[PDB]
């Protein structure tokens, strides 16, 4: 349970919530969690026309 | 120690010669005739490689020569393989088109000893 | 026995093909080989002599 001041922070000030190991990905062979993360990130960030969006 | 003397197995047909198989043997003697390259490749592979006439590349060529001199007797070709041609000729040859190289064996010394005499 | 059982737990319990078997079953058949009966197979393995190599491709012709 790490404190908020010790996490690697993004330039917008967004600290991560749950940090997982990169080693669990080549053994378990789970692609699509990163795709779900990249889809849910592109949904939630604002566009600097929100219609016709890949949801 | 000496080498083997028994050649390949003879090929016997179940019928008589119809005077066309002799034509096929005469025409197919031109192709698959590598008798002109075995004695050349042995002479270069004994110049470029130490412990000459006792390495494996000399024994396969000595077996292929004994198989190729029996091509007029039995119908078994030589089949000279790849990765055995030298692609480089010594000094004691008349091949002035190949990318030759200076021979360090006794044959290069005997080739230079006549150039020392004709000078 | 612990060094053999540790190799027995950490072994593949799935067969490779229909002709071969699993590495666990191959260890089980070797360790439990004193059953003195079963399946009437009795597989043998013959070899070749030394003087067959005096001919050209003598081993293949002999086999």
């Amino acid at each position: 349970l790490e404190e908020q001041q010790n996490f690697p922070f993004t330039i917008q000030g967004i600290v991560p919530d749950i940090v997982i190991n990169p080693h669990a990905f080549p053994s378990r062979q789970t692609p699509g969690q990163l795709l779900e993360a990249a889809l849910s990130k592109g949904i939630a960030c604002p566009i600097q026309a929100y219609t016709k969006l890949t949801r | 120690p000496p080498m083997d003397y028994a050649g390949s197995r003879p090929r016997l047909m179940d019928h008589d010669v119809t005077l066309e198989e002799i034509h096929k043997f005469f025409v197919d003697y031109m192709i698959s005739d590598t008798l002109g390259v075995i004695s050349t490749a042995h002479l270069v592979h004994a110049d470029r490689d130490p412990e000459k006439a006792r390495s494996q590349k000399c024994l396969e060529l000595a077996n292929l020569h004994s198989r190729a001199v029996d091509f007029a007797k039995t119908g078994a070709p030589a089949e000279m393989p790849y990765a055995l041609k030298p692609r480089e000729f010594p000094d004691f040859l008349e091949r002035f088109e190949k990318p030759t190289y200076i021979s360090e064996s006794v044959f290069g010394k005997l080739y230079r000893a006549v150039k020392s005499s004709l000078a | 026995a612990c060094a053999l059982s540790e190799a027995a737990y950490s072994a593949l319990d799935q067969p490779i093909s229909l002709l071969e078997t699993s590495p666990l079953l191959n260890l089980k058949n070797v360790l439990e080989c004193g059953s003195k009966k079963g399946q009437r197979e009795q597989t043998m393995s013959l070899y070749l002599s030394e003087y067959l190599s005096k001919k050209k491709h003598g081993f293949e012709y002999g086999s």
Partner: protein, 62 residues
Amino acid sequence: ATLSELAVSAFKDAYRDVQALAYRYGDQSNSFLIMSKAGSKGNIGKLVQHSMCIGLQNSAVS
């Protein structure tokens, strides 16, 4: 059963050149290549199924 047994081994050695394409196209900063060359977790057979193609799929049961 024997023609499949002589073809699984004939696919598994011809697939060794198909699996050798992850080093040409992949970069040296790839995390899967680093974790496979280090021997910590995974190999190139997991990276081929991740990126290029799954490959041979067979079962030992009739």
